């Protein structure tokens, strides 16, 4: 399970932000699943200890 | 003289309306 | 979209010009990061679009 990441964990999450925004837009314009999962899992809550899993879930929604 | 509010990752920018939601019920008694 | 640490650093500054300059620098850095992400996304998006439009025609045929 390769999870190489840069030591600068400051600007990387910026892309994450974009991703989540995109995801939000999609679910707003193309409602596929409930938004309750979005409320439970929020990037601002610091509970996403595995951002790779969040990205994989987002790509799954596609 | 009140206990520090559990921010729980709820930033409050100056002069910005924000909503705080902490799962802990202990803050309910204080409120 | 600056991190809470950046906001605290701005609040640390006392002189009005100093805090204003720090805020402007943070704005510039956030704009640079957002522009980098947007350009990079656009490049990836065109790379998708590099797929010959026959993919759109196939999608319409289906």
Swiss-Prot record, chain A:
Subcellular localization: Mitochondrion matrix
Residue spans crossing the bilayer: none
Tissue specificity comment: Duodenum, heart, lung and liver, but not thymus.
Role of this protein: ATP-dependent serine protease that mediates the selective degradation of misfolded, unassembled or oxidatively damaged polypeptides as well as certain short-lived regulatory proteins in the mitochondrial matrix. Endogenous substrates include mitochondrial steroidogenic acute regulatory (StAR) protein, DELE1, helicase Twinkle (TWNK) and the large ribosomal subunit protein MRPL32/bL32m. MRPL32/bL32m is protected from degradation by LONP1 when it is bound to a nucleic acid (RNA), but TWNK is not. May also have a chaperone function in the assembly of inner membrane protein complexes.
Assembly mode: Homohexamer. Organized in a ring with a central cavity. The ATP-binding and proteolytic domains (AP-domain) form a hexameric chamber, while the N-terminal domain is arranged as a trimer of dimers. DNA and RNA binding is stimulated by substrate and inhibited by ATP binding. Interacts with TWNK and mitochondrial DNA polymerase subunit POLG.
Recorded family membership: Belongs to the peptidase S16 family.
Illness: CODAS syndrome: A rare syndrome characterized by the combination of cerebral, ocular, dental, auricular, and skeletal features. These include developmental delay, craniofacial anomalies, cataracts, ptosis, median nasal groove, delayed tooth eruption, hearing loss, short stature, delayed epiphyseal ossification, metaphyseal hip dysplasia, and vertebral coronal clefts.
Domain note: The Lon N-terminal domains are crucial for the overall structure of the protein, maintaining it in a conformation allowing its proper functioning. The AP-domain (ATP-binding and proteolytic domains) has a closed-ring conformation in the presence of AMP-PNP and its N-terminal entry gate appears closed. Upon ADP binding, it switches to a lock-washer conformation and its N-terminal gate opens.
Name under which the protein is recorded: Lon protease homolog, mitochondrial
Originating organism: Homo sapiens (Human)
Annotated gene: LONP1
């Amino acid at each position: 399970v390769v999870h190489e990441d840069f030591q600068v964990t400051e600007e990387v999450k910026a892309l994450t932000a974009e991703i989540v925004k995109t995801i939000r837009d999609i679910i707003a314009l193309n409602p596929l699943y409930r938004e309750s999962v979005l409320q439970m899992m929020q990037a601002g809550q610091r509970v996403v200890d595995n951002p790779i899993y969040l990205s994989d879930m987002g790509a799954a929604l596609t | 003289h009140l206990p520090l509010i559990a921010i729980t990752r709820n930033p409050v920018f100056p002069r910005f309306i924000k909503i705080i939601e902490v799962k802990n019920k202990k803050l309910v008694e204080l409120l | 979209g600056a991190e809470s640490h950046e906001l605290q650093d701005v609040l640390e500054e006392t002189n009005i010009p100093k805090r204003l300059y720090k805020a402007l620098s943070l704005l510039k850095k956030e704009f640079e990061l957002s522009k980098l992400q947007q350009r990079l996304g656009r490049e990836v998006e065109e790379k998708i679009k590099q797929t010959h439009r026959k993919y759109l025609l196939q999608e319409q045929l289906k």
